[PDB]
Amino acid sequence: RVADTVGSGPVNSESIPALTAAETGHTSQVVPSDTMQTRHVKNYHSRSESTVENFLCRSACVFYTTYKNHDSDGDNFAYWVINARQVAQLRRKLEMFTYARFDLELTFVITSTQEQSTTQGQDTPVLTHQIMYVPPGGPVPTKVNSYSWQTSTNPSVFWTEGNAPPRMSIPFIGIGNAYSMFYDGWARFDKQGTYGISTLNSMGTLYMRHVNGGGPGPIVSTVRIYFKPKHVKTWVPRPPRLCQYKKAGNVNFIPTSVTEGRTDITTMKTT
């Protein structure tokens, strides 16, 4: 909840509530009660919706891929290296804090589309997919059927099209006491090579694939990944991203104006 207004009458003193020294770096705790007369107002407004928890706690697409039901050579499955910088929306949000800590709520929205052919007599059964997570170091799949899909240890989800979207929870899997949103450092101790957040980045890959081919007719399924931070903790606020994003592995940008211009320094007709 917000602070309510205090009743104010006229004043005559050597007290200077109106003047400070911004050079201090301290922000003024000046209310309207100073510098003007005010009535009394019991303010009930709540800041409940601007809590860090609520600002972040909302599913957001972070990526998506494709894969066919058919293809000789295996080669008809997809993968994606987990990371939250390939999407503009959420990245900018998470990047309003230097360090953060939170659990994640994974939600997948799987859909299938059928493409044009010549194939006839098609009466396709339900489609069942498989999303498999592979922690870093684990054996990665090669073809739509390499042994590794047994997931004897790697966790994964099986899902039949037509049902409620799949969903899981992930604990704070960070190595350090928190996730790092930025890293003004290098990977190797001789500053040679990778520079940027891209070095802290290392959370395994996600593998998708059709379990059953369905029919002989060509089909293309798409998997959408949705993150949703929970039980959040945030440290060190930062200036929101001004320039548009240019790369997923770094801060790179092309210089941008601070805002838009108007005619005079006096124009109320804002841009």
Partner 1 sequence: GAQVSTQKTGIHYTNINYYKDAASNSANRQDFTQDPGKFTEPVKDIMVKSMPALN
Partner 2 sequence: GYSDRVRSITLGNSTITTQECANVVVGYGVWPAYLKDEEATAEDQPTQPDVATCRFYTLESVMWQQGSPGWWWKFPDALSNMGLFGQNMQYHYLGRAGYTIHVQCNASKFHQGCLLVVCVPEAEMGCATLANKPDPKSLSKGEIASTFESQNSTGETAVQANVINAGMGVGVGNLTIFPHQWINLRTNNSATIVMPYINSVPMDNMFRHNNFTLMVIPFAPLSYSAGATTYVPITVTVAPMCAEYNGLRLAGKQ
CB of 270 to ligand SPL, least distance (A): 34
d(CA 191, CA 108): 39
Site string for ligand SPL, 125-164 (x = CB under 6 A): --------x---------------------xxx-------
Tell me the window of 42-50, 51-59, 83-91, 121-129 that interacts with ligand SPL (CB under 6 A): 83-91
Find the largest Cα–Cα distance for the chain.
93
Tell me the three state secondary structure of residue 180: strand
CB of 44 to partner 2, least distance (A): 29
Beta strands in 38-160 (DSSP E): 60-68, 77-81, 97-114, 128-134, 156-160
- In sequence order, the β-bridge partners of residue 41 are 5
Positive or negative, the CA dihedral 82, 86, 88, 93 is positive
Report if residue 26 touches partner 1, rule: CB under 8 A: yes
Q: Which of 20, 89, 111, 267 binds partner 1 (CB under 8 A)?
A: 20
Q: Which of 18, 88, 173, 242 binds partner 2 (CB under 8 A)?
A: 242
d(CA 1, CA 20): 28
d(CA 193, CA 196): 10
How many residues of this chain bind partner 1 (CB under 8 A)? 32
* Residues in 142-161 at the binding interface with partner 1, rule: CB under 8 A: none
DSSP summary character for residue 134: E
CB of 175 to partner 2, least distance (A): 8
Tell me the window of 36-44, 51-59, 80-88, 235-243 that interacts with ligand SPL (CB under 6 A): 80-88
Report if residue 230 touches partner 1, rule: CB under 8 A: yes
Report if residue 202 touches ligand SPL, rule: CB under 6 A: yes
Report if residue 29 touches partner 2, rule: CB under 8 A: no
Q: Which does 29 bind (CB under 5 to 8 A by kind): partner 2, ligand SPL, partner 1, none?
A: partner 1
- Among 119, 222, 206, smallest CA distance to 161 is for 222
Count of beta carbons in the 10 Å neighbourhood of residue 137: 8
Contact (CB, 8 A) for 209 and 144: yes
Residues of this chain that bind partner 1 (CB under 8 A): 1, 13, 15-17, 19-21, 23-30, 34, 47-48, 51, 53-54, 57, 103, 169-172, 230-232, 237
